[PDB]
Amino acid sequence: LNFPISP
Amino acid sequence: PQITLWQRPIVTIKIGGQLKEALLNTGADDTVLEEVNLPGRWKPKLIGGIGGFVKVRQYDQVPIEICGHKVIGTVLVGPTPTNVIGRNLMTQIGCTLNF
Amino acid sequence: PQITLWQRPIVTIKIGGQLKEALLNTGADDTVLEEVNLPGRWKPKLIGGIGGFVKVRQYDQVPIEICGHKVIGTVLVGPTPTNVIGRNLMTQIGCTLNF
Q: Which of residues 50-89 of C touch B (CB under 8 A)?
A: 50-51, 67, 69, 81, 84, 87
Kind plus residue range of the DSSP H or E element containing B89:
helix B87-93
* Sequence letter at residue C46: L
With contact defined as beta carbons under 8 Å apart, do B51 and C51 qualify?
A: yes
Count CB atoms within 10 A of the CB of residue C12: 12
Greatest C-alpha distance within chain C = 40
Question: What DSSP character marks residue B68?
Answer: T
Facing residue for B95 by CB, picked from C51, C91, C97: C97
The CA distance from B34 to B20, in Å, is 10
Cα angle C35, C40, C44 (rounded to 5 degrees) comes to 65
Method: X-ray
The CA distance from C22 to C32, in Å, is 9
Gapped junctions in chain A, after residues (C–N > 2.5 Å):
none
Query: Residue B59: which residues within 8 A CB-CB, separation 6 or more?
Result: B38, B40, B41, B42, B74, B75, B76, B77
- With b for 16 or more beta-carbon neighbours within 10 A and e for fewer, the B50-76 pattern comes to eeeebebebbeebebebbeeeeebbbb
Facing residue for A4 by CB, picked from C23, C29, C49: C23
Q: What is the resolution of this structure in A?
A: 1.7
Cα angle B80, B81, B84 (rounded to 5 degrees) comes to 65
Taken in order B7, C12, C61, C57, the sign of the CA dihedral is: positive
Domain containing C77 equals 1-99
DSSP calls for chain C: -EE-SSS--EEEEEETTEEEEEEE-TT-SS-EESS----S--EEEEEE-SSSEEEEEEEEEEEEEETTEEEEEEEEES--SS-EE-HHHHHHHT-EEE-
- According to DSSP, the residues that pair with C12 across neighbouring strands are C21
* Sequence letter at residue B68: G
The total of structural domains in chain C comes to: 1
Gapped junctions in chain C, after residues (C–N > 2.5 Å):
none
Number of H helices, E strands in chain B: 1, 8
The CA distance from B35 to B21, in Å, is 12
Which one, of B81, B83, B78, B79, lies nearest residue B14 by Cα? B83
Tell me whether residues C26 and B9 touch, CB distance under 8 A. Answer: yes
Greatest C-alpha distance within chain A = 19
How far apart, in Å, are the Cα atoms of B39 and each of A6, B17, B61, B63, C29?
26, 10, 11, 11, 34
Q: Give the C-side interface with A, CB within 8 Å.
A: 23, 25, 27-30, 32, 47-49, 81-82, 84, 86
Cα angle B54, C27, B79 (rounded to 5 degrees) comes to 25
Number of H helices, E strands in chain A: 0, 0
CA distance A5 to chain C (A): 9
CATH code for the domain in which residue C46 is found: 2.40.70.10
Which of A1, A3, A6 to mutate to probe the B interface, most B CBs <10 Å?
A3
Touching partners of B (3+ C-beta pairs < 8 Å): A, C
